Paper text:
The function of these proteins is crucially dependent on phosphatases, which are homologs of either Cps4B in Gram-positive bacteria or WzbK-30 in Gram-negative bacteria. Furthermore, we show that both Wzb and Cps4B are capable of completely dephosphorylating full-length Wzc, establishing that Cps4B activity is not confined to its cognate CpsCD complex.
We solved two structures of WzbK-30—one in complex with the phosphate reaction product (2.5 Å resolution) and another in complex with sulfate, a mimic of the reaction product (2.2 Å resolution). The two structures superimpose with an rmsd of 0.3 Å, and although the phosphate-complexed structure is partially disordered, the active site is well defined and the positions of the two ligands are identical. Briefly, the enzyme has a mixed αβ structure with a central four-stranded parallel β-sheet surrounded by seven α-helices. The active-site cavity is marked by the reactive Cys13 residue, which sits on top of the β-sheet. The WzbK-30 structure is a product complex, containing a phosphate ion that is coordinated by residues Arg19 (N, N1, N2), Gly15 (N), Asn16 (N), Ile17 (N), Cys18 (N) and Asp119 (O2). The phosphate is positioned such that the phosphorus oxygen bond is in line with the S atom of Cys13, correctly oriented for SN2 attack.
Author numbering: -4 to 56, 60 to 111, 115 to 147
The structure:
């Protein structure tokens, strides 16, 4: 979990997790990717829309592209491939413990330095407020990991 130059040794892979894997986690993944170019950053959804491209609204919103993103179901097998798991909603943690018991010990909230709301099927203003949350949350994580 901490706390400096040591963090770079402990976490080289990060799994960003939301519900549908077409709004929140796609954005968070891309944000962390250009902040941590050396790390393995992917995403999944506890109730993902498998093989679905990123949501239209999420795509619209700063200026970063969601290139080649497809919906990915979260599985214990997948958790086994990542040092750190970041979830958007607190409910995800509980659903993670249920799906992958071994992963719970290595999962925290995206924006640990409050949870991020589900923008799915909401106004563009909601996507902006959420995006803002994702960006600043992604920055606090970038510094806390080098
Ligand atoms: Ni479909």
């Amino acid at each position: 979990p901490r706390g400096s130059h040591m963090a770079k040794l402990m976490f080289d892979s990060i799994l960003v997790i939301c519900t549908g894997n077409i709004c929140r986690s796609p954005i968070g993944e891309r944000l962390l990717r250009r902040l941590l170019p050396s790390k393995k950053i992917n995403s999944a959804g506890v109730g993902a829309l498998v093989d679905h491209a990123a949501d239209e609204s999420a795509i619209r919103v700063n200026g970063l592209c969601l290139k080649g993103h497809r919906g990915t179901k979260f599985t214990s097998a997948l958790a086994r491939q990542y040092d750190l798991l970041l979830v958007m909603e607190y409910s995800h943690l509980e659903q993670i413990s249920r799906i992958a018991p071994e992963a719970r010990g290595k999962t925290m909230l995206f924006g640990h330095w409050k949870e991020i709301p589900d923008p799915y099927r909401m106004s563009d203003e909601a996507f902006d407020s959420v995006y803002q949350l994702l960006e600043q949350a992604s920055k606090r994580w970038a510094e806390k990991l080098g």
